[PDB]
Write an enzyme that holds these catalytic residues in place. Structure first.
Site, PDB file in Angstrom:
ATOM      1  N   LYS A  47     -94.709 -89.681  -8.514  1.00 13.94           N
ATOM      2  CA  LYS A  47     -95.254 -88.366  -8.010  1.00 13.94           C
ATOM      3  C   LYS A  47     -95.700 -87.617  -9.312  1.00 13.94           C
ATOM      4  O   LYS A  47     -95.778 -88.118 -10.470  1.00 13.94           O
ATOM      5  CB  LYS A  47     -93.954 -87.785  -7.514  1.00 13.94           C
ATOM      6  CG  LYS A  47     -92.856 -87.325  -8.593  1.00 13.94           C
ATOM      7  CD  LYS A  47     -91.607 -86.758  -8.047  1.00 13.94           C
ATOM      8  CE  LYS A  47     -90.757 -86.331  -9.046  1.00 13.94           C
ATOM      9  NZ  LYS A  47     -89.340 -86.577  -8.599  1.00 13.94           N
TER      10      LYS A  47
ATOM     11  N   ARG B 240     -80.216 -78.312  -2.903  1.00 10.52           N
ATOM     12  CA  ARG B 240     -81.471 -77.813  -2.708  1.00 10.52           C
ATOM     13  C   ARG B 240     -82.182 -78.106  -1.211  1.00 10.52           C
ATOM     14  O   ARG B 240     -82.108 -77.082  -0.346  1.00 10.52           O
ATOM     15  CB  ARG B 240     -82.613 -78.315  -3.602  1.00 10.52           C
TER      16      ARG B 240
ATOM     17  N   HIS C 138     -79.837 -87.687  -4.320  1.00  9.94           N
ATOM     18  CA  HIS C 138     -80.284 -87.610  -5.501  1.00  9.94           C
ATOM     19  C   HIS C 138     -79.551 -86.933  -6.370  1.00  9.94           C
ATOM     20  O   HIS C 138     -78.951 -85.685  -6.160  1.00  9.94           O
ATOM     21  CB  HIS C 138     -81.602 -86.644  -5.519  1.00  9.94           C
ATOM     22  CG  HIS C 138     -82.491 -86.667  -6.866  1.00  9.94           C
ATOM     23  ND1 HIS C 138     -82.904 -87.676  -7.584  1.00  9.94           N
ATOM     24  CD2 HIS C 138     -83.288 -85.687  -7.500  1.00  9.94           C
ATOM     25  CE1 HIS C 138     -83.650 -87.567  -8.615  1.00  9.94           C
ATOM     26  NE2 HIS C 138     -83.843 -86.057  -8.537  1.00  9.94           N
TER      27      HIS C 138
ATOM     28  N   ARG D   8     -84.714 -95.788  -7.932  1.00 12.18           N
ATOM     29  CA  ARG D   8     -85.798 -94.862  -7.966  1.00 12.18           C
ATOM     30  C   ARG D   8     -86.080 -94.284  -9.446  1.00 12.18           C
ATOM     31  O   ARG D   8     -86.100 -93.143  -9.396  1.00 12.18           O
ATOM     32  CB  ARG D   8     -85.893 -93.806  -6.857  1.00 12.18           C
ATOM     33  CG  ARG D   8     -85.270 -94.362  -5.476  1.00 12.18           C
ATOM     34  CD  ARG D   8     -85.462 -92.956  -4.504  1.00 12.18           C
ATOM     35  NE  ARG D   8     -84.843 -91.789  -5.168  1.00 12.18           N
ATOM     36  CZ  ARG D   8     -83.447 -91.663  -4.835  1.00 12.18           C
ATOM     37  NH1 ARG D   8     -82.959 -92.399  -4.201  1.00 12.18           N
ATOM     38  NH2 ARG D   8     -83.051 -90.420  -5.506  1.00 12.18           N
TER      39      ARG D   8
ATOM     40  N   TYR E 266    -106.405 -66.594 -35.094  1.00 11.52           N
ATOM     41  CA  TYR E 266    -105.736 -65.396 -34.558  1.00 11.52           C
ATOM     42  C   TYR E 266    -104.886 -64.743 -35.056  1.00 11.52           C
ATOM     43  O   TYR E 266    -103.684 -65.201 -35.500  1.00 11.52           O
ATOM     44  CB  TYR E 266    -105.708 -65.454 -33.224  1.00 11.52           C
ATOM     45  CG  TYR E 266    -107.139 -65.847 -32.394  1.00 11.52           C
ATOM     46  CD1 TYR E 266    -108.234 -64.815 -32.432  1.00 11.52           C
ATOM     47  CD2 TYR E 266    -107.083 -66.720 -31.391  1.00 11.52           C
ATOM     48  CE1 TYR E 266    -109.430 -65.438 -31.946  1.00 11.52           C
ATOM     49  CE2 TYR E 266    -108.376 -66.894 -30.667  1.00 11.52           C
ATOM     50  CZ  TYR E 266    -109.485 -66.328 -31.100  1.00 11.52           C
ATOM     51  OH  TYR E 266    -110.853 -66.612 -30.508  1.00 11.52           O
TER      52      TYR E 266
ATOM     53  N   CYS F 288    -105.118 -71.951 -30.342  1.00 15.63           N
ATOM     54  CA  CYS F 288    -106.018 -71.142 -29.549  1.00 15.63           C
ATOM     55  C   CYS F 288    -106.152 -71.679 -28.247  1.00 15.63           C
ATOM     56  O   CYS F 288    -105.741 -72.831 -27.916  1.00 15.63           O
ATOM     57  CB  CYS F 288    -107.289 -70.847 -30.277  1.00 15.63           C
ATOM     58  SG  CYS F 288    -107.194 -69.798 -31.763  1.00 15.63           S
TER      59      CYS F 288
ATOM     60  N   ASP G 249    -108.589 -73.187 -27.210  1.00 18.25           N
ATOM     61  CA  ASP G 249    -109.291 -74.664 -27.394  1.00 18.25           C
ATOM     62  C   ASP G 249    -109.372 -75.163 -28.569  1.00 18.25           C
ATOM     63  O   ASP G 249    -110.065 -76.151 -28.744  1.00 18.25           O
ATOM     64  CB  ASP G 249    -110.783 -74.501 -26.531  1.00 18.25           C
ATOM     65  CG  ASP G 249    -111.596 -73.653 -27.531  1.00 18.25           C
ATOM     66  OD1 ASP G 249    -111.036 -73.064 -28.542  1.00 18.25           O
ATOM     67  OD2 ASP G 249    -112.821 -73.691 -27.242  1.00 18.25           O
TER      68      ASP G 249
END
Ligand SMILES: *Cc1c(COP(=O)(O)O)cnc(C)c1O
Ligand SMILES: *Cc1c(COP(=O)(O)O)cnc(C)c1O
Lengths: 366, 356
Positions: free
Chosen positions: A32, A130, A162, A213, A256, A303, A305
Site C-alpha cells: 500500500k 477503527r 490487525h 502480512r 532564511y 528552505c 528547495d
C-alpha cells in the site's frame, strides 16, 4: 538532481528473512501507499520473485494499478469508500476484505451485477476499534456468508484482523481466536486466517496463523526499533548531488532568518532539495548528511528547495557534483530513516513516504 | 476520495492585490515547486490573466514544463545543478539567472552550440549567503558579461537578489540588503554595464516594504493567498487551497461517535497533528482522536443524535470562510510554516480546480 534509490537486492533479502520467520505460513507482502514510497509495482515484482505468495494493499485503486502494470499474483484490498462499486475489483480478480454488514451488502450487489464470484475476506475488530466487524455483528455476518457461499456468490478465502510482548497482543490474539471458533461453531469455514503484521511476524511467531502480512519489514525498516535492525536491510537510500561548495567567514548568517551564524571560518555545501521534496523542515539544524564518508550537519533553516550543510574548516574534501547521502541502511555510516524519525518526533514509516518533488525514485536490480 | 481544491478565483484576487502593492513595479509570479503545490501551469495562466508580467521558477526543468504546457510568457529560472545543459533552455526561450562565472561560461558554450542569444540575469548575494555572486567576484562577472554582450551572445536582462527574511519586514537586515543591492548596481555602472531591470522583493517585501521595491517584484506565497506576515492577519489575501475528504465510516464508541477519514501521513497529513488537529464537518469542529495512521485517521463527532453521514465532506484546511481551520493553523500545531503545509498534500489527495 536527487534520488530515492531503492535497492531491490535488499527487498529480496528482507523478504527472504521474513519467510524464514514466518515458518510454514505464506507471505502477503504489503505494498500500500505506493510500496511505502518505494514503488508498489517494482517492490511487488521483486517480493513475488523472492517467494512472497500474495500482495496486500489498502484500496481497490491500488490493486488495479498493480494489475494494469501486469501483476497477476493474488491481491487483497481492505479499505473501501462507502458506496464503492466493487465491480471493477471483481472483474480484475481483486480480493475484497469486508469490515461491516453494509459493505458485504455492497459487495453482494456487485456480485449480482457482474456475475462474478467474490473471493472475500472478513476483517474483524479485536480491540482495534477503527473498523472491522464486531463480535455482536459477527453472527449475522456468518449467516449471510453461508447463504452467499451456498450459491457460489462468494468464495470464503479469509479471516483477518490487525494488531510486541505487551499483553494487549495476547488478548487481541485470543479475541481473534474466538472469532475463528464462532465461525467454526456455526459451520462456516475460511481457507486461511491471518493477524500478523511485521512486528508480530518477527517478534511473536507464536501468534502466526496461515499467512503473515508484513509491510514495514519488507522495506527493511525495523518493526520494533528498540530491538535494532532485526536482521533487515533498509532498501531506500535518499541522496543528492552537491550543487555548490563555498567558504564563509565567522559571524556570517546562512539561509532564511539567519538562525545560524558561523562561530568560525568554515566550508559549506549547498544541497538543492528542500521541504517541498520531503526534507522535513523540522530537521533544520538537526540532521547530518554523509559526504565522501564524513558526517556534515545541516546549518540554518531548511528552505523550500534547498539547504546547507557544514563541511568544517578541515582540508576541503568535497566538490560540486559529489554525492550527499541523507539517509539509507547505514552501511556506509550514513544516517537511517529511524534517525530522522527520532529527530523529527515521528516514525520511519512517515520518513520513507515523504520523498517527492525532485527526488527521483530509481532502482538497483537484485 | 480526497482533494486539494485550488480556487483560481482566489489566485486572481491575490494577484490583483499584489499588483496594487507593486505599483509601477512589474510582477513576476513565482510558481516554483509546482506552484507551491497548487499547480504551476494553472496558477501561471491565471496570474498572467490577472496582470502578472512574468513567471519565476527555481529550475530550468520547471520552466520547460510551463513551456510544454503552452506557456509562452517570459520565465526565469535561477537554481541550476552542476552538469546542467543550458541548450534546451535557450531553445525554449527560457531566461537563465547565473550565480557564478562558471555558470556563465557554461551558458556561453550553450549559446555557441545552439546559435541562440541568452537572456541573462545575474543573481548576487546581498546577505542570504547561499547561491549568489559576492561583491568581490562581481567585477570579473561584469567583465565577462560585457564582452559577451558586445559580441551578441547575451541580452543583459536582470540583476536579482533574495531577502534573508521571508516574514519580518521591519528588521533592519531588509534595509541593509537593499543598500547592498544598490552597491552592486554601482559596480555595474563603473564597469560600463547596465541591466534592464533589478529586483529583490519577495511577498513580504512587496506587501510590507514597498519603500524597498526596485524594478520588479517576485511574490510567491502571497499569490496562493497565504499571509507573508502571519502576525498581521490575512493581509487582504484569500488562501486558494482547500483540502478535504469524505467521511468513510461512522462509529459508535464517555459515549460518543467517531468519523474515519481515509487519508493519512502518506497523503501529507503530518503525523504530529494527531490528537491535536480539528476538522470541519457539517459546520462543527471535530477534534482528531488517536494517532494519524499512514492512510487514515479518526475524529470525534461527539455523543447524541448524528448530524453526520458517510460520504459527507470534511474540511481539513482552507481560507477559513466557512470556519474551517487554516494552513496557518496546521503550521501552528506542527511547529512549521504554511509554505510547508501547502506543499504537503499528495498520494490520494487529488488536486482540483474551481474556475475564477
Ligand atoms: C499497513 C498494514 C499492514 C502492514 O503493517 P506493518 O506494520 O507495516 O507490517 C498489515 N495489515 C494491514 C491491514 C495494514 O493496514
Ligand atoms: C521562493 C522564491 C521567491 C518567493 O518568495 P515568497 O516568500 O514565497 O514570496 C522569490 N524569489 C526567489 C528567488 C525565490 O526562490
Amino acid at each position: 538532481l536527487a534520488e530515492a534509490m531503492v535497492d531491490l537486492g535488499a527487498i529480496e533479502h528482507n523478504v527472504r528473512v521474513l519467510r524464514e520467520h514466518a515458518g510454514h505460513a505464506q507471505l502477503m507482502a504489503v505494498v500500500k501507499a505506493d510500496g511505502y514510497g518505494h514503488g508498489a509495482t517494482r517492490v511487488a515484482q521483486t517480493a513475488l520473485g523472492a517467494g512472497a505468495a500474495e500482495l496486500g494493499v489498502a484500496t481497490v485503486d491500488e490493486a488495479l494499478a498493480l494489475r494494469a502494470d501486469g501483476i497477476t499474483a493474488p491481491v487483497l484490498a481492505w479499505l473501501h469508500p462507502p458506496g464503492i462499486d466493487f465491480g471493477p475489483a471483481l472483474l480484475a480478480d481483486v480480493q475484497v476484505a469486508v469490515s461491516s454488514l453494509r459493505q458485504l451488502d455492497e459487495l453482494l450487489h456487485a456480485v449480482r451485477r457482474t456475475g462474478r464470484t467474490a473471493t472475500v475476506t472478513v476483517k474483524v475488530d479485536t480491540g482495534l476499534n477503527r473498523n472491522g466487524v464486531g463480535p455482536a455483528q459477527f453472527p449475522a455476518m456468518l449467516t449471510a456468508l453461508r447463504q452467499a457461499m451456498a450459491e457460489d456468490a462468494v468464495r470464503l478465502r479469509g479471516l483477518m484482523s490487525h494488531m510486541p510482548d505487551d499483553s494487549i497482543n495476547d488478548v487481541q490474539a485470543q479475541r481473534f481466536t474466538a472469532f475463528l471458533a464462532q465461525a467454526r461453531e456455526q459451520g462456516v469455514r475460511f481457507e486461511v486466517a491471518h493477524l500478523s503484521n511485521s512486528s508480530a511476524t518477527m517478534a511473536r511467531p507464536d501468534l502466526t496463523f496461515d499467512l503473515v502480512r508484513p509491510g514495514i519489514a519488507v522495506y527493511g525498516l525495523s518493526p520494533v526499533p528498540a530491538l535494532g535492525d532485526m536482521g533487515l536491510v533498509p532498501a531506500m537510500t535518499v541522496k543528492c548531488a552537491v550543487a555548490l561548495v563555498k567558504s564563509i567567514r565567522a559571524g556570517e548568517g546562512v539561509s532564511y532568518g539567519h538562525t545560524w551564524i558561523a562561530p568560525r571560518d568554515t566550508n559549506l555545501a549547498l544541497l538543492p532539495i528542500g521541504y517541498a521534496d520531503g526534507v522535513f523542515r523540522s530537521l533544520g539544524g538537526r540532521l547530518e548528511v554523509l559526504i565522501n564518508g564524513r558526517r556534515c550537519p545541516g546549518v540554518g533553516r531548511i528552505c523550500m528547495d534547498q539547504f546547507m550543510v557544514d563541511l568544517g574548516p578541515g582540508p576541503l574534501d568535497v566538490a560540486e557534483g559529489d554525492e550527499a547521502i541523507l539517509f539509507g541502511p547505514g552501511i556506509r555510516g550514513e544516517p537511517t530513516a529511524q534517525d530522522w524519525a527520532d529527530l523529527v518526533g515521528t516514525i520511519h514509516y512517515e520518513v520513507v513516504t515523504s520523498p517527492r518533488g525532485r527526488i527521483t525514485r530509481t532502482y538497483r536490480e537484485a
